């Protein structure tokens, strides 16, 4: 946790740099392999933890960038992130919008089709 301990010394902590880190991770595991994707999945959870800053209705990209192949080293991660995001979208102001929905649906309907194993955590979210 030394990296976290060092990271904890967040002098001049802001917010926006998070964006760079997120887009960097998306590229890295858009390719390579499932092990890398698994590494990124853990990183994504950490990014969410790191994402202390929030702006309700202005964030939007609560999901959106999350609409990734929810399969292999991603199905559980996408679910964890989506479920966590759903909680975030319920929490406080909630700011549960909808102009991302068409794509969310494209991913939901295919990944919950395929082998047709949706899990109750989906429905609860």
Partner 1 sequence: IVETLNFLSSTKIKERNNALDELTTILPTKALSTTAEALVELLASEHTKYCDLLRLSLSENRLSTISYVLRLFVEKSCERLLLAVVPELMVKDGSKLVDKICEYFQSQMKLSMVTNFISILLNLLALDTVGIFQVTRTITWTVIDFLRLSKNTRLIMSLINQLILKCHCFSVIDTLMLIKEAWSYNLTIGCTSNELVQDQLSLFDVMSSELMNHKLPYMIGQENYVEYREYILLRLSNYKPQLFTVNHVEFSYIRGSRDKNSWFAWLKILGITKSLLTYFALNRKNENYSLLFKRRKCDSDIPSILTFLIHLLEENSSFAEQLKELLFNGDMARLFKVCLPSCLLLANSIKSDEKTINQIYDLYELSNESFMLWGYLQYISSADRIFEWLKSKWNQFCNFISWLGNWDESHKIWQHFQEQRELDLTRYNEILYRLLENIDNLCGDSTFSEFIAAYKRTTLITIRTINVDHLVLDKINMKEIVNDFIRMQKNKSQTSTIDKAVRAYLLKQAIGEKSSYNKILEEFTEVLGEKLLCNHYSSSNQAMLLLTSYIEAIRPQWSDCNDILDWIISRFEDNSFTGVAPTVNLSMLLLSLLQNHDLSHGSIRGGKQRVFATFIKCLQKLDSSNIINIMNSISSYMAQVSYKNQSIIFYEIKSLFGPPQQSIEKSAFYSLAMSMLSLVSYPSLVFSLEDMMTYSGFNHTRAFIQQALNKITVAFRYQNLTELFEYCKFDLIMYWFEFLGRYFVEISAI
Q: Which residues bind partner 1 (CB under 8 A)?
A: 31-43, 73
Q: Which is nearer to partner 1, 33 or 106 (CB)?
A: 33
State the CB neighbour count (10 A cutoff) for residue 11: 4
User: Three-state DSSP class for 57?
Assistant: helix
Where would I find the H helices in 14-119?
Answer: 17-28, 34-50, 75-88, 101-111
Q: Which is nearer to partner 1, 28 or 65 (CB)?
A: 28
- For residue 113, the minimal CB distance to partner 1 (Å) is 23
- For residue 115, the minimal CB distance to partner 1 (Å) is 18
Q: Does residue 112 contact residue 118 with C-beta atoms inside 8 Å?
A: yes
Q: Which is nearer to partner 1, 33 or 64 (CB)?
A: 33
Q: Which is nearer to partner 1, 60 or 73 (CB)?
A: 73
Q: Does residue 94 contact residue 55 with C-beta atoms inside 8 Å?
A: no
- For residue 46, the minimal CB distance to partner 1 (Å) is 11
Where would I find the H helices in 29-100?
Answer: 34-50, 75-88
- For residue 45, the minimal CB distance to partner 1 (Å) is 10
């Amino acid at each position: 946790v030394q990296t976290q301990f060092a990271h904890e010394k967040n002098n001049t902590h802001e917010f926006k740099l998070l964006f760079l880190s997120v887009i960097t991770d998306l590229e890295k595991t858009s390719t390579y392999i499932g092990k890398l994707r698994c590494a990124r999945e853990l990183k994504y959870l950490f990014v969410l933890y790191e994402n202390v800053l929030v702006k309700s209705s202005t964030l939007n990209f609560i999901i959106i960038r999350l609409s990734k192949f929810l399969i292999d080293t991603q199905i559980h991660d996408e679910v964890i992130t989506i479920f966590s995001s759903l909680l975030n979208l319920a929490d406080k102001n909630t700011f549960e919008i909808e102009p991302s929905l068409p794509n969310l649906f494209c991913k939901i309907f295919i990944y919950l089709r395929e082998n047709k194993q949706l899990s109750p955590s989906f429905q609860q979210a």
